[PDB]
Structure formats: C-alpha cells, structure tokens
Symmetry: C3
Subunit: 94 residues, 3 copies
C-alpha cells in the first residue's frame, strides 16, 4: 500500500474524482490547503502497489492544465489500513 | 514509530479524544476533511510500535457506529518526532 | 526524500516562511488544524531531500519555538517519490 497525496487546483476536483472512480478507486479524502498564496486542494488516497502507477498517471492526466502551478503528487508508504466499521485490519508488506 | 491517522465522523471527536487520553496518548492533530460526500475529521497521532495495536483498538471502539461510512485508520512509518518547545528530536529506525 | 510535517502556532507562519525561503526550500502547503484541549495551529507540509532534513528541521524549530508549552511538533516520514503534475516527471531520491 502507498498513500498518494495530490495537491491540485481546486477546479480540477471533479475530473480527478471521475478519473479515480473510473480507475476503480473507492474513497478519497479532500481538504483545503494554501500552496506557497494560491488556494489548492489536497486529495488523499491509499491504494495497493499494483494500481499506484496507474492512479498517478490518471491523476496527472486529470489534474494537468499545462501552466505553472499544476501541483505535485507525493507517494509514501502505508503499512496497514483498518476499516473502523468492522475492525478489519489489512496489512501489506514487501 | 508509527503515524496513526484516523478519518472519523465529526461527532466522534470527543469519544476518540477520551479513548486516546485513557490510552496514555498525549497530543493529537485534528483537521477537517471531506470524505468521498460527508464531512469527516482526520485525527493524527504518532506512537511506538508496541502501542499501535492497543491504540488502534481503542480508536476503532470509540469511532465505530456500525453504519457504512465509519471511516478508516492508516498506519504508516515515521522516522522522527521533534518537540518544538524543547528542540528535542526523537528518532527511530523504520 | 522525506516528508516534513510541522504543526505550529499560527502567528509563526511568516517567520517559518522566511526561514524556509532563505534555506532554499521552494514550495510548501499550509492548512488549518487543531492541536489537542483544542488550540488553533497551522500544518505545514514540505518534502525535502535527505541531505536537507536536519538543516530544515533545525531552522523550523528556531523559527517556531517560543519556549512555552504548546509550541507544536514536527513529524519526519519517508516519501518514495514526488510527481510533478504538469510534466508528469517522477522524482525519486535514495542513498
Ligand atoms: Ca473541473
Ligand atoms: Ca460524540
């Protein structure tokens, strides 16, 4: 599992959401941030190793405009994910 | 050392806070996020490996309602925690 | 490549921004958070190279500290890669 954090332009949320849905990603977290100011949107998703490259490419395509200030995507390790409702703990290790 | 971040229903803040305090956890960071939507709160804490299971369990018990949309908890590696007031840096191998 | 997350007193933003600028740090994301009772804080996120971490943390602490309880925390974690959205360039850093 990897955490994918995309800092995008606010108006790119919808096409990014569509790109994620069509990519099989269920669930994402969004928050407002200031990118140094310019208002930006932080999107957080945690996906399996196999779909990381695919998601990033979909995210880049959807969030891209071509001009300066398009943002960045950060990829970081996540050991486990726990579903609160059931207490189900999923751990992925190399 | 692990970063434990929980995305919970906003009305679960107080009970999660209580659970965390009773569990010996001192200090948490709370941010407002939108979970795709519904308003959610992101709770961040950092703890030693030997506390993770216990902390996650208290977190699940406190944040759950049994209804779909209870949220999730992500466990990830943290290299260091620095206390700004004292400048003390606490580092652990990942 | 490390993620540096600093939770600081809101009024320390400008000092921290200045510290990071003359430290060669370009780009940071800032958000409002509550540090627990509740106290308004600012979350500053930056991703720097391994060789910059120690220096950046030192500058951050010097900038954000007051000496009073509640000055905040800085969490340092691993980042596998950084992808520039515009060009699609994936940057990885290792040793
Ligand atoms: Ca749009
Ligand atoms: Ca409650």
């Amino acid at each position: 599992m990897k955490k994918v954090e995309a800092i995008i332009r606010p108006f790119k949320l919808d096409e990014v959401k569509i790109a994620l849905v069509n990519a099989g990603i269920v669930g994402m977290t969004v928050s407002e941030v200031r990118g140094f100011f310019l208002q930006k949107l932080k999107i957080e998703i945690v996906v399996d190793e196999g779909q990381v490259d695919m998601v990033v490419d979909k995210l880049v395509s959807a969030a891209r405009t071509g001009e300066i200030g398009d943002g960045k995507i950060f990829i970081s390790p996540v050991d486990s994910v726990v579903r609160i409702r059931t207490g189900e703990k999923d751990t992925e290790a190399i």
